[PDB]
Amino acid sequence: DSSRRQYQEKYKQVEQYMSFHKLPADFRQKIHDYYEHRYQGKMFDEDSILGELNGPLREEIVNFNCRKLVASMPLFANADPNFVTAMLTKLKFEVFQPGDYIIREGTIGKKMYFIQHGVVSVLTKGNKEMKLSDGSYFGEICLLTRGRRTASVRADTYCRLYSLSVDNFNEVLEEYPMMRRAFETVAIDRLDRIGKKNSILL
Amino acid sequence: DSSRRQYQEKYKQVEQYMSFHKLPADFRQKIHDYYEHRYQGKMFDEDSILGELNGPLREEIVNFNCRKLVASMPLFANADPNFVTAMLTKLKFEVFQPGDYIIREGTIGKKMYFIQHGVVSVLTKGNKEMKLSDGSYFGEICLLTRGRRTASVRADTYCRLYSLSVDNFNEVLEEYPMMRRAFETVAIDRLDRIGKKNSILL
Amino acid sequence: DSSRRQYQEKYKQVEQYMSFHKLPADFRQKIHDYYEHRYQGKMFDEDSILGELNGPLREEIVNFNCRKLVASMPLFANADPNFVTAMLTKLKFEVFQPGDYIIREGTIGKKMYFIQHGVVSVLTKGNKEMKLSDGSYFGEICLLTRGRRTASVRADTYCRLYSLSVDNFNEVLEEYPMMRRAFETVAIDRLDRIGKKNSILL
Amino acid sequence: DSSRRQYQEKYKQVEQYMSFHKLPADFRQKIHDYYEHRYQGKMFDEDSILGELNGPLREEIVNFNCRKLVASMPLFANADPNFVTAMLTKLKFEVFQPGDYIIREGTIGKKMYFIQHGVVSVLTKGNKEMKLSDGSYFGEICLLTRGRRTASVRADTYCRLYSLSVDNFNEVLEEYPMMRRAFETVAIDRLDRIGKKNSILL
Ligand SMILES: Nc1ncnc2c1ncn2[C@@H]1O[C@@H]2COP(=O)(O)O[C@H]2[C@H]1O
Ligand SMILES: Nc1ncnc2c1ncn2[C@@H]1O[C@@H]2COP(=O)(O)O[C@H]2[C@H]1O
Ligand SMILES: Nc1ncnc2c1ncn2[C@@H]1O[C@@H]2COP(=O)(O)O[C@H]2[C@H]1O
Ligand SMILES: Nc1ncnc2c1ncn2[C@@H]1O[C@@H]2COP(=O)(O)O[C@H]2[C@H]1O
Numbered sequence: 001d002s003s004r005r006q007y008q009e010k011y012k013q014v015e016q017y018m019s020f021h022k023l024p025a026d027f028r029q030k031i032h033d034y035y036e037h038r039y040q041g042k043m044f045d046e047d048s049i050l051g052e053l054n055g056p057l058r059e060e061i062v063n064f065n066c067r068k069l070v071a072s073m074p075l076f077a078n079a080d081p082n083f084v085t086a087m088l089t090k091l092k093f094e095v096f097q098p099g100d101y102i103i104r105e106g107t108i109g110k111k112m113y114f115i116q117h118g119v120v121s122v123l124t125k126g127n128k129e130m131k132l133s134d135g136s137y138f139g140e141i142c143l144l145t146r147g148r149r150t151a152s153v154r155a156d157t158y159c160r161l162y163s164l165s166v167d168n169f170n171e172v173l174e175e176y177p178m179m180r181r182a183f184e185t186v187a188i189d190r191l192d193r194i195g196k197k198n199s200i201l202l
Numbered sequence: 203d204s205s206r207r208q209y210q211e212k213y214k215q216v217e218q219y220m221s222f223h224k225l226p227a228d229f230r231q232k233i234h235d236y237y238e239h240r241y242q243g244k245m246f247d248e249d250s251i252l253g254e255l256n257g258p259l260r261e262e263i264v265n266f267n268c269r270k271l272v273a274s275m276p277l278f279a280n281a282d283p284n285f286v287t288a289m290l291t292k293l294k295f296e297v298f299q300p301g302d303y304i305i306r307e308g309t310i311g312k313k314m315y316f317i318q319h320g321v322v323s324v325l326t327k328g329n330k331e332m333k334l335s336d337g338s339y340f341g342e343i344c345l346l347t348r349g350r351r352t353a354s355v356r357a358d359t360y361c362r363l364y365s366l367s368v369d370n371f372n373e374v375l376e377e378y379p380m381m382r383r384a385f386e387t388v389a390i391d392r393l394d395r396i397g398k399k400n401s402i403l404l
Numbered sequence: 405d406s407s408r409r410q411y412q413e414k415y416k417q418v419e420q421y422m423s424f425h426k427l428p429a430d431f432r433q434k435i436h437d438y439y440e441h442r443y444q445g446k447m448f449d450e451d452s453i454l455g456e457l458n459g460p461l462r463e464e465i466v467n468f469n470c471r472k473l474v475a476s477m478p479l480f481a482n483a484d485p486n487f488v489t490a491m492l493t494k495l496k497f498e499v500f501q502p503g504d505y506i507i508r509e510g511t512i513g514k515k516m517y518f519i520q521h522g523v524v525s526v527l528t529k530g531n532k533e534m535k536l537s538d539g540s541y542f543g544e545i546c547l548l549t550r551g552r553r554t555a556s557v558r559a560d561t562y563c564r565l566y567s568l569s570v571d572n573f574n575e576v577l578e579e580y581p582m583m584r585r586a587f588e589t590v591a592i593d594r595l596d597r598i599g600k601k602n603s604i605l606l
Numbered sequence: 607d608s609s610r611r612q613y614q615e616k617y618k619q620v621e622q623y624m625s626f627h628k629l630p631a632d633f634r635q636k637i638h639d640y641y642e643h644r645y646q647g648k649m650f651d652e653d654s655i656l657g658e659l660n661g662p663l664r665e666e667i668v669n670f671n672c673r674k675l676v677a678s679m680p681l682f683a684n685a686d687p688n689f690v691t692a693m694l695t696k697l698k699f700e701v702f703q704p705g706d707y708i709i710r711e712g713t714i715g716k717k718m719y720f721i722q723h724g725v726v727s728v729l730t731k732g733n734k735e736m737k738l739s740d741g742s743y744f745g746e747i748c749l750l751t752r753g754r755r756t757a758s759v760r761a762d763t764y765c766r767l768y769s770l771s772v773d774n775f776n777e778v779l780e781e782y783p784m785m786r787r788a789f790e791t792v793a794i795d796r797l798d799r800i801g802k803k804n805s806i807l808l
């Protein structure tokens with residue numbers, strides 16, 4: 001009941017802050033809808049709880065919680081069980097509401113995303129659209145190239161994503177260099193299909 | 203009512219600290235006057251509240267709260283809506299009392315400022331004074347040049363400013379290089395009018 | 405009684421988190437067994453308590469708490485009392501349950517370990533096993549070489565270890581360069597006995 | 607009364623921690639004697655309180671609290687009022703008990719000290735002793751040279767010092783390069799009187 005009580009306290013604090021800034025009741029509604037989807041009436045201090053454990057127990061728990069997600073991801077079917085673990089322990093859960101732009105083309109990228117549930121549209125400057133759904137990943141090209149985002153990515157439904165920051169990305173890939181080659185190969189093919197080629201991926 | 207209660211608790215804690223250090227009742231008055239203007243009886247944990255949201259919702263809220271400020275700023279009238287967003291999310295509100303020196307000439311600079319409400323005087327070593335008011339910015343030349351502050355800046359009224367740190371400055375400007383050129387052009391003209399030229403701005 | 409009360413509060417919070425994630429009662433049992441061995445019904449905020457002290461008092465306390473551990477370690481019998489102090493203040497206590505792999509061969513290493521109580525097995529890719537017990541250390545070769553772990557290390561009993569991170573390691577060894585030579589000599593001999601030679605240790 | 611209550615709570619927490627580690631009643635006495643001299647029955651959260659203020663108010667308060675200390679220090683009599691301010695805002699108060707070694711010869715140095723109240727002995731390897739008292743500073747040579755401590759420094763009475771870390775030191779001295787020359791000159795003379803010369807001070 002501490003987890004529920006903490007949800008209630010933090011939400012009330014948001015309500016107060018929204019009241020103070022005189023936000024539209026319709027936008028407050030949007031915030032509430034976000035809290036409901038993202039937290040579902042509960043807040044745990046995950047990092048604090050896992051911080052009390054040792055390494056193996058931390059990795060056991062996360063592997064356990066992320067079983068359905070891992071089953072769904074081609075990246076991981078075939079991959080080393082320990083690469084899968086090194087990624088999982090670095091993931092941040094995030095939720096987006098339909099219509100929200102997750103990534104805008106042309107900006108500097110600082111994270112990658114894995115789709116657990118939802119549909120996203122990858123939109124090029126030139127108006128071509130490709131859909132990505134459960135088990136796919138996007139946002140990695142910028143991280144490989146140290147360049148800019150090559151396309152926009154817009155939630156077409158509620159999306160439940162896990163993000164991975166550029167430092168955690170580069171770290172896991174120092175440890176698993178074969179997996180860098182796997183990401184670059186897909187990146188090259190994805191770029192080709194949108195009229196692009198970057199030779200730093202070769 | 204948590205926001206008010208937190209103001210009261212933190213103020214009382216300051217009172218205690220001032221009592222302990224036996225500060226003059228007139229200087230305590232000055233502190234109280236500062237708390238009143240800066241907080242207006244409320245303390246929110248903004249960073250904690252916004253930390254619970256996703257990116258788009260964070261940016262929506264800030265864009266919303268900063269509408270009057272943005273309207274007032276020539277820097278932003280004409281500028282990309284997304285450059286404006288990248289700056290806004292990095293701003294720290296600060297208040298100064300009349301007579302306070304915000305910037306002293308000759309020192310190393312670590313932040314820039316945007317005026318929301320108030321009058322400042324830009325004072326040269328040679329005694330020339332230029333006034334800056336709502337919608338203007340100062341403190342940027344040092345950040346561009348990696349040199350020292352080229353003039354002093356003194357609050358002539360209560361000022362309500364937003365500051366931007368040198369790291370956030372350089373970060374936004376990596377992402378929007380055209381805006382670096384816009385800052386340098388104004389910087390060159392401002393320097394010329396005070397007898398200065400620095401070739402690292404060309 | 406604050407220390408006990410804090411154990412109870414934090415454990416209850418873990419229970420809640422495990423209930424939420426619907427973890428097997430047998431794995432929850434494993435977690436509880438871990439809490440019991442690691443904390444023994446108490447949680448102190450060590451870093452906060454020691455943070456209030458000065459340097460000498462901090463070092464006195466730690467030297468005192470770690471007397472049995474220091475007696476048991478050949479590394480330290482003969483070593484400078486001040487090298488021993490510089491290491492001790494940087495140690496993190498950790499507990500492992502029988503069967504847990506502390507180190508997997510082939511991965512990047514970020515810490516070293518000192519055994520206070522327990523038996524570990526050092527396992528090579530080629531299936532050779534060497535046991536290490538109270539007073540020994542493992543996990544240092546990777547830190548010296550900036551390479552990868554040269555063997556796996558598996559707890560064969562409950563182990564009570566103290567870890568030392570790669571930054572604290574390199575820091576103490578900048579201050580005591582003779583002790584780097586002592587670690588490298590043992591490292592060279594340990595590698596030789598497992599079919600390995602790395603010339604960056606010479 | 608929050609400040610007193612916080613002293614009581616934190617002390618009780620130390621008592622508990624000492625009871626747990628079965629520390630000698632005589633060493634517990636030493637800890638209590640330290641708390642009494644260092645805190646005098648009160649704990650303020652200084653950094654949190656000053657964090658709520660603007661720059662000028664922060665600097666006013668510290669200048670005010672440190673008036674007796676500043677009067678006593680030759681380094682500062684004559685120095686720019688703004689160099690004095692830049693140092694003061696970076697100082698950490700610390701207390702040492704008679705007999706404690708503040709600095710051991712031969713180690714890497716990470717801070718400097720200013721004496722507010724007390725007597726210290728500067729002891730060379732060769733057994734020569736020089737006393738330093740209110741208004742003096744020690745611990746700076748290592749910071750200038752990036753070398754090792756050139757002498758030991760032992761509290762001969764209770765000492766009330768303010769420390770300045772190597773980063774804050776180098777930072778203030780980037781901003782006031784004339785003051786680096788002032789420190790180096792005294793450093794050269796101090797070294798000469800103990801049989802030493804380091805050419806990186808020229
Ligand atoms: N042809 C494609 N098919 C699917 N996804 C793509 C394609 N091209 C780009 N993307 C994604 O759009 C993302 C936009 O950000 P990034 O460039 O970092 O990474 C990009 C890809 O992950
Ligand atoms: N001619 C000018 N007109 C208006 N403002 C100025 C002028 N010259 C300098 N300033 C401001 O004074 C500031 C002092 O700090 P900075 O050099 O960092 O940046 C400087 C400018 O932003
Ligand atoms: N021959 C050996 N005898 C005992 N321990 C060893 C031997 N070889 C390797 N180890 C330990 O196994 C550890 C695995 O990680 P590291 O390479 O970092 O350091 C290694 C050693 O500390
Ligand atoms: N001749 C001297 N007189 C007074 N103090 C000294 C003398 N020589 C060294 N010290 C102090 O002893 C300190 C030991 O640490 P540091 O070398 O960092 O700096 C040294 C000086 O500040």
